[PDB]
From a paper:
Here, we present the crystallographic structure of the apo form of DpoZ of vibriophage ϕVC8, composed of the 3′-5′ exonuclease and polymerase domains. Through extensive screening and optimization, we could eventually obtain single crystals that diffracted to 2.8 Å. The two molecules contained in the asymmetric unit of the DpoZ crystal represent different conformations. The transition between the two forms of the molecule involves mainly two subdomains moving mostly as rigid-bodies: the thumb subdomain known to hold the nascent double-stranded DNA and an extension in the exonuclease domain, present in a reduced form in only a few other PolA structures (see below). Thus, the two DpoZ conformations are hereafter referred to as the ‘thumb-exo’ open and ‘thumb-exo’ closed states. Their RMSD is 2.0 Å for the whole chain, 1.8 Å for the polymerase domain and 1.4 Å for the exonuclease module. Importantly, modelling of the dsDNA substrate in the polymerase domain of DpoZ indicates that the thumb subdomain in its closed state prevents the correct binding of the nucleic acid substrate. The three insertions conserved in the ϕVC8-like DpoZ subfamily take the form of external loops of several to about twenty residues, scattered around the polymerase domain's active site. Indeed, modelling a leaving nucleotide in the exo catalytic site in the thumb-exo open conformation showed that residues R161 and M165 of the helix E2 could contact the nucleobase. Interestingly, although their side-chains are unstructured in the absence of this leaving nucleotide, in the closed state these residues are much closer to the core of the exonuclease domain, assuming a particular conformation which blocks the active site from accepting a nucleotide.
In contrast, a group of bacteriophages belonging to families Siphoviridae and Podoviridae has abandoned the usage of one of them, adenine (A), replacing it with 2-aminoadenine (Z). Recently, two classes of replicative proteins found in ZTGC-DNA-containing phages were characterized and one of them, DpoZ from DNA polymerase A (PolA) family, was shown to possess significant Z-vs-A specificity. Phylogenetically speaking, DpoZ are split into two distinct subfamilies: ϕVC8-like and Wayne-like. Both harbour 5′-3′ polymerase and 3′-5′ exonuclease domains and display a strong exonuclease activity. ϕVC8-like DpoZ were studied in detail for phages ϕVC8 and SH-Ab 15497, showing catalytic efficiencies greater by 1–2 orders of magnitude with dZTP than with dATP. The enzyme exhibits the typical fold of the PolA family, with easily identifiable polymerase (pol) and 3′-5′ exonuclease (exo) domains.
Residue numbers in the entry: -1 to 479, 487 to 629
The structure:
Amino acid sequence: RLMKLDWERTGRRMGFIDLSKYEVWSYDTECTGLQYKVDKVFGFSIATPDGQSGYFDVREQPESLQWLAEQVEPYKGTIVCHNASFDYRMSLHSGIKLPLSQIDDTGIRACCINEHESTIFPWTRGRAGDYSLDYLAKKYVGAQKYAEIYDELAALFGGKATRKTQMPNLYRAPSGLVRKYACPDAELTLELWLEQEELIKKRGLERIVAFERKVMPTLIRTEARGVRVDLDYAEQAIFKMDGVVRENQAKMFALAGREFNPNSPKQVREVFGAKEEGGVWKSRDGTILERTATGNPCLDADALRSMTDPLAAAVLELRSNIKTKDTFLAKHVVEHSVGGRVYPNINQMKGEDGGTGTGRLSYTGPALQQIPSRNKRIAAIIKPAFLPEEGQLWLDSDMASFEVRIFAHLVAAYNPAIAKAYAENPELDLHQWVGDLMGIPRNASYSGQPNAKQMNLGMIFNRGDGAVADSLGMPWEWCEFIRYKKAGREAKSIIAAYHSQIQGVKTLATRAQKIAEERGWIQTAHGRRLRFPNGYKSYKASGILIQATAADENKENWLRIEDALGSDGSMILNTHDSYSMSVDENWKPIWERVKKAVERQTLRVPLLLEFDGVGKNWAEAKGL
């Protein structure tokens, strides 16, 4: 069906062939489940660039691990998996040592090539699209697994005849069936990797593709190491969250005037006062609600966040703390822990919000980035559950004012004063440095008082003049066009005065949006391509550049820390702009090496790593 190889003629029967005769080959594991350090590999499959492919049940045929180890020890070429982290770790636990610097990831390559596989544009047709192998193979090589195996599986086990339903069953099926399932997987993976070479070659993505490949071993190593936990405390924390939830509930019933079930869509419509008029749905705080497909007024999380109603923040707070007690604590740290540690997965390309279009990484199971930062009470309940390595101390540090320095550096191209200001005072606070020039304060003391922080943050998130006015408490009002926030007379004066005292901020926004509209994309200095199909949301161009450049330099941090610790320690984790490390008891020499290895002046403004504290666990290092 228009493919390089014809796998049905040549494949599915490969044996202990010689793999050194290839520059690339495919690899795919089948495991008893998904839990690292618990489930084990039960078989695997490999495809070769000359039409061969094979599957081996390691239980029935243990001669194939010996051949594998033999093939892999001299092998100098590229190994391809779709999920390099999963395949390499499940193998490692099962005693299959692959050379990690030689593994490649079809899904990370897919993100470098188009970050919007799941983005819903105003013109899309169907369901989302994603980074699964089935979907990327269909879209890029036009290939697809035959549905006959899923039917055979369902006839054996029961459920829907789908990959999602039948994967948990594969180690229970006869190996000739898993051979029909697993061989095309390695075939489609190698054909995907082959077609990505062309697209990466034709589109000049060699730099960002190489960068993420350089990053990958440092995250799989970290992923495989895990974080040590204190489970005896963790059970105590679930009793503390109990009280925190009971309070969240009381505060929420108070704001509604009654008790109710936040899980009943009807009662949540009642407490927020959702009324319809002339085709429009409003909630009691005046917010205009969109409709659900079912025609109901939509009160999802995106809508709650857009309200000023305190009841919205209360609902979201209660949902969040329930998820922290039940999913974060009970399930991921207490239940699924293994020998006193937890092993979350690190998504190298998907950020904390599920967005793919920025270099951001993010944890799952437990989601360590989802411990709050503006509620020190919750962090103080959770963070004592996380421990350094046995014998070591917990060192916490912070990239100070990270995303603002990235901003300063991009606009520093069009303003040498910003570069010189940070040169004299490397610890300069950009907000205070702008307030000190406009004659306005860094922060608000009174409502309606203009401040530098809110100004600076409205340039960072490309924000219209009314959005800026609103964040300041300055007069504004709604207007048709269809609906938008029109800035008042007093707000357009400070925004204009802002762009006169701070030259270059407007040039950042405009050149970024322009190039996004002409050429179709812009790029970080590491070469991450940020794409704006049909100029969609192109006015956001400069802000997204900041998130991406700051995510580039964050992956640059892991590389530099992991190297600087060496044998003296290990990076525990990274949340937001913070970096935790397990270090030896003589910690000051180790810390000063990490600090000089990370702190750099290779951008237009310095990057600083500021010490945060040391302790016997995560909370104590932070001072809680």
